[PDB]
Amino acid sequence: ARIGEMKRVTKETNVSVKINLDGTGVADNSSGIPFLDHMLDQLASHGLFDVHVKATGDTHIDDHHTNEDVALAIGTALLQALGDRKGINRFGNFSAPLDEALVHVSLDLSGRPHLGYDLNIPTQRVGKYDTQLVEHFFQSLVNTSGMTLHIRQFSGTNSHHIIEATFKAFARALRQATEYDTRR
Amino acid sequence: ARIGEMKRVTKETNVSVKINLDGTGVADNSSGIPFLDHMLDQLASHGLFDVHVKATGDTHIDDHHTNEDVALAIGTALLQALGDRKGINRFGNFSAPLDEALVHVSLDLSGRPHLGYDLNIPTQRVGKYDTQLVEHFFQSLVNTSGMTLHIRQFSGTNSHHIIEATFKAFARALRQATEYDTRR
Amino acid sequence: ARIGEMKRVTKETNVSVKINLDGTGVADNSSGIPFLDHMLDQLASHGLFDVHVKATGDTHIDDHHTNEDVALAIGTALLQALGDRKGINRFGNFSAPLDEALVHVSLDLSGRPHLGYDLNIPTQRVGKYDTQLVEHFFQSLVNTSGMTLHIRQFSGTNSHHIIEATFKAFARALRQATEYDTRR
Amino acid sequence: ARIGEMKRVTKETNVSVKINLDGTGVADNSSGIPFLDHMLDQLASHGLFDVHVKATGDTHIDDHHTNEDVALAIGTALLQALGDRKGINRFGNFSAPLDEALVHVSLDLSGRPHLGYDLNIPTQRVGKYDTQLVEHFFQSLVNTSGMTLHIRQFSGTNSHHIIEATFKAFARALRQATEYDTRR
Amino acid sequence: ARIGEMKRVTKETNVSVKINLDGTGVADNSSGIPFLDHMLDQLASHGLFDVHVKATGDTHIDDHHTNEDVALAIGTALLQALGDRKGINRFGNFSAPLDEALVHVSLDLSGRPHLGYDLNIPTQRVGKYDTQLVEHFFQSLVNTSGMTLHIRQFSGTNSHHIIEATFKAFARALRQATEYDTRR
Amino acid sequence: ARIGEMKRVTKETNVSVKINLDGTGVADNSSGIPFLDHMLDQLASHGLFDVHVKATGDTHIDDHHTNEDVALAIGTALLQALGDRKGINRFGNFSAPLDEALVHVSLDLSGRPHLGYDLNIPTQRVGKYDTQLVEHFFQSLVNTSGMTLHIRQFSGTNSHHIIEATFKAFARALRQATEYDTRR
Ligand SMILES: [Mn+2]
Ligand SMILES: [Mn+2]
Ligand SMILES: [Mn+2]
Ligand SMILES: [Mn+2]
Ligand SMILES: [Mn+2]
Ligand SMILES: [Mn+2]
Ligand SMILES: [Mn+2]
Ligand SMILES: [Mn+2]
Ligand SMILES: [Mn+2]
Ligand SMILES: [Mn+2]
Ligand SMILES: [Mn+2]
Ligand SMILES: [Mn+2]
């Protein structure tokens, strides 16, 4: 079983993250951003990962500093759990429909960080969550994990449906890339 | 050491401000606007100034009256600390990058107030802070300090990055203008 | 194990080609076009095929006649190795990301030749290789193998990345079409 | 004196790189790309760095693989020479004129990689050097060094002048960011 | 101390010019064009140069012949004072704000003459001075001094403010280029 | 007989140039750029000049540095051969047709350098010669000779015809300007 963990203390945030690639879908997420916790639970259920996030920070100013630090910690823990990446598929593709929304995700674990972001979120706030942080979350994740990620939206009107369809497609594409190849 | 202070009591706000131009970066800022306190801390760290702000006011209506009165007090304290402005550079230029954002600041301490504002902030709120108050803050500062200030944005998408890059470039351009010229 | 071979002698070129569909990724390619050899190696590694190409020709005039004859020989050897095509999937789909580039390939082995080509290569030369020969290579391959092939580009700026992402997606889509179906 | 070195052996390239930040401008560059060696010499002379590059590779196919591997090695050696980055300016700005060309460079050493590229090179080849590799060189450098880099062109017609003005502005902006701050 | 002088007698003008690069700002300018004398005084004060100009000519026809001959003499005296240009920075950059006006100047002392002029002066006369002579002054200066000069305007409405901001930025950029570099 | 010579040694090029204005058309040109030698021969035959150029340089990088240094040496040798320019026409005009191409050249020897370039060369390479160097050649020639030169194209499609018609018109216009005026 491949397991990654990370702990970082700064002047703004305290974050502890644990990821298990060979899991059954256990989700224990508790940060100061309730909507981000809803998103991280879908990554565990649809990807069959074990995700544990504990974070506290200066949310009285904004959610920006907490959102950025959580994404960096998840990316670092993913890199250490992967190790040498020998015998894995390294490629993942998935399209996820959610009512009127449809998002396609293509990723490859290569060591070269790149993000291709094409999303059109109509509203500025979903709950208390600022929708500009969706791009910032995925940009910080690929900078520490060294992955190439492409996200494209084909349809969608509702802000909740578009974002939560994106996390479903990312979880299942990451699962396919991390499974061992059966060779011939 | 050049030190300026100001104290003003009105029917809406009570403000006390202390500025030291020859400092080491001590920041003690406490008003009713948490995001403005985050911005004023960067002016102390990047500009090597000592900034102390204490303010209370009618924030139950809006942040407008408190934001305006703090900016006027900072400008007045800056003017008294400068004094005769003899032997100083009087000019400052700096461009500050922050991820995808890039802001250039040009200022000159001449006694003639003028503001050139060219910023494109995409969202209406960052946290609880209204983004229309960024222009109002800098307009009130140059009216009491008598400075010529130009702000121009070359790139940027994130609202937090654009504003906080502006304060970094302003702090380092003000620091260069207040240093003593070495002559030949 | 399904193995195909071909040998053709004309007044311009001499070509010998051997293909093994049940392979481990052995690549032995030696023609007069170094960039084409780089492309054919990726088909062996990503598709788990055994590819052997030996060719000599009148490269002092152009690479056109050598490039065309190699593609025809590969298509003929593929057809003979497939045989009756009984019990195979016959369909393959894959999207391959390579930094900023993203290419999708859809193919089906039906006996009816058709090529759908949608690529936008910005430069005229990559090394010494003429970029007009990428279309000519795939058109000659489907004319002798009798396959329906669709290629579409979604993003990309670098000429090397776009072409070499196309060969990766073609290799993995061809591999999926040639595997035996497990039925129920 | 801060010195960084790197050695990487792959199936395509062999690269050894040595960088000294406290140097006098010694340049010893020898790869398979003569135009890149001309560019790396200007970084030593204008930046007062000591740069040593030795590389061999499969240039018979293209210059792509050699150009990419050299840029990655330089970025890694720069990161190790910087160390904790304590007491340095961390910011650099410079505009460099070269006849009709004018390029501005803004950089900051923060640990977050980002590239802003705005160049308009009119021709496809300068000598034997492919002009698409100028972007690929700077993208690979910031991915391993963790720096934020912005490049903007204001004028220029000649391809040689535009590129070689870019390297002059980058060298002097990097020099300013690596000097120790004098504090008060 | 580096000092340059020039004396030229033609059928239209008599000009004597003396320039000292290591000065304290002494200005003694007396030609037949009062507005040009106002401009040359700012070059001495802001650049810390010693400038002495004495000229008489056929101003009853136009100011063209006198303006052209003064600029040629200043450029020649600057070249002789520079000498071998060993140990100097050779590069200068400055942006100067003057109320609503903002002008940026970039120069380099290389021996190759080039002028990049981008100014938008709204009126045809400032006092008795023809505004077409601003371009003619700087073109004649770079032809005799062998310098590369770029001038760009970012804002401005008043003709007096735009021109006199240009001379301020040119003086401080020339001062930076002529100072001795401190090396490491 | 008016004869000019020049010899310059730099770190990149070694150039020796000899020009005779009262000649019979002897051409002895040998540099590392064969197409430039073809152009310089037409200047001797059509202008009745004696031109001798010997140059070696770092052509393994590019032809840029060799092309620039040859043009500077020719311009300097032309200036010294002219001397006081007493009794000469100082003006030259010629239009040269070459099949479908037609180029007009107007020049005047005044001591004030200026280049007016209006050419539309359709291709990027003629042989191994980069077509961007045609402008760079004539710009460097007028900077050292102090001449005013205007070049305008009225028709033409073939790259070889357009360039070689330009050199024919320049040679005959320069010949007319250097002949002694017969007065009344
Ligand atoms: Mn951020
Ligand atoms: Mn939901
Ligand atoms: Mn107000
Ligand atoms: Mn912040
Ligand atoms: Mn053909
Ligand atoms: Mn490759
Ligand atoms: Mn690459
Ligand atoms: Mn060069
Ligand atoms: Mn004139
Ligand atoms: Mn004035
Ligand atoms: Mn040049
Ligand atoms: Mn010819």
Residue numbers in the entry:
A (entry chain W), B (entry chain A), C (entry chain K), D (entry chain L), E (entry chain O), F (entry chain E): 78 to 261
From the paper:
The crystal structures cover the MtHISN5 sequence starting from Gly77 or Ala78 through Arg260/261 (chain and structure-dependent). Both cryoEM structures (unliganded and IG2 complex) have been reconstructed from EM maps with octahedral symmetry, and therefore contain 24 identical protein chains, spanning from Ala78 to Arg261 (IG2 complex) and Arg262 (unliganded). The cryoEM and crystal structures share the same pattern of Mn2+ coordination. The Mn2 coordination sphere is incomplete in the MtHISN5-unliganded cryoEM structure, owing to the lower map resolution. The corresponding position is occupied by a water molecule in the unliganded cryoEM structure or by the imidazole moiety in the MtHISN5-IG2 complex. To this end, we studied the cryoEM MtHISN5-unliganded structure in the Caver Analyst 2.0 and Caver 3.0.3 PyMol plugin (Chovancova et al., 2012; Jurcik et al., 2018). Most of the tunnels are distributed along the 2-, 3-, and 4-fold axes. The average diameter of the tunnels along the 2-fold axes is large enough to allow infiltration only by very small molecules (< 60 Da), such as EDO, FMT, and water. Larger molecules, however, could permeate the inner cavity of MtHISN5 through the tunnels along the 3-fold and 4-fold axes, which are approximately 2.5 times wider in diameter.
